[PDB]
Amino acid sequence: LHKEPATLIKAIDGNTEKLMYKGQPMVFRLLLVDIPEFNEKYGPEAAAFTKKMVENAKKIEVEFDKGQRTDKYGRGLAYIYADGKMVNEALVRQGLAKVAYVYKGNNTHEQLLRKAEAQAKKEKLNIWS
């Protein structure tokens, strides 16, 4: 797979956070994870973690997998990196998201993420506490 550039578009004017990819604003959805919603346990902690990772990055990159690049809502489907650190993996490794939504065809980093889940679960972190 290939990492490609993007920049963070911060939330303003009642809009949501987005990434600018090829010079266009897009909502992205992280591949291979299920993240608690804001009203659920660890929802605020997952949002805060992601926001810190992306806001503090010098360089954001998006890495599409080999299958579909957008979902039925028009969201980009990608692995997102902040200064080389994968956000999808880091969230799962902290127990702030579960491996999920593994569609045949966009599963390149499934095993990496499952190992991070198993380590988060053994360490009884967050959702596994």
Ligand SMILES: Cc1cn([C@H]2C[C@H](OP(=O)(O)O)[C@@H](COP(=O)(O)O)O2)c(=O)[nH]c1=O
């Ligand atoms: C992560 C992911 C989600 N989706 C769709 C499946 C779910 O559809 P439904 O909206 O019908 O449940 C939805 C879950 O996203 P959220 O977890 O962001 O709500 O996004 C994909 O189609 N491909 C993906 O790779």
